[PDB]
């Protein structure tokens, strides 16, 4: 995966995510996904091209059970993203890079 990805913890979402400066996607995944290996390489893409104005970020539910309900996520994947600690868009299930980036372009822009 990228180096570029932040994989998050249970108990480092909080600091991580909404205490983030700029926009940070979220990705939660698990071991046994299709889906989730669909869009990997696709997010590694995301994270090199939208440097500077955005941070992807990876939350394992395999790893971390905590988090995901809290969040309404009822499915693997789910894209949240956030902004000062809000989330402001969400997208489940897998994309094409140009569907993701189509909405990132909308959404990043969006206050």
């Given at each position: 995966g990228s180096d570029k990805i932040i994989h998050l913890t249970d108990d480092s979402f909080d600091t991580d995510v909404?205490?983030?400066?700029g926009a940070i996607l979220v990705d939660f995944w698990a071991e046994w996904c299709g889906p989730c290996k669909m869009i990997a390489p696709i997010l590694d893409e995301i994270a090199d091209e939208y440097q500077g104005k955005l941070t992807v970020a990876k939350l394992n539910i395999d790893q971390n059970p905590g988090t995901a309900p809290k969040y309404g996520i009822?499915?693997?994947?789910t894209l949240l993203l956030f902004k000062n600690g809000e989330v402001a868009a969400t997208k489940v299930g897998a994309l094409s890079k140009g569907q993701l980036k189509e909405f990132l372009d909308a959404n990043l822009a969006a206050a």
């Open positions: 909404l205490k983030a400066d009822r499915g693997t994947p």
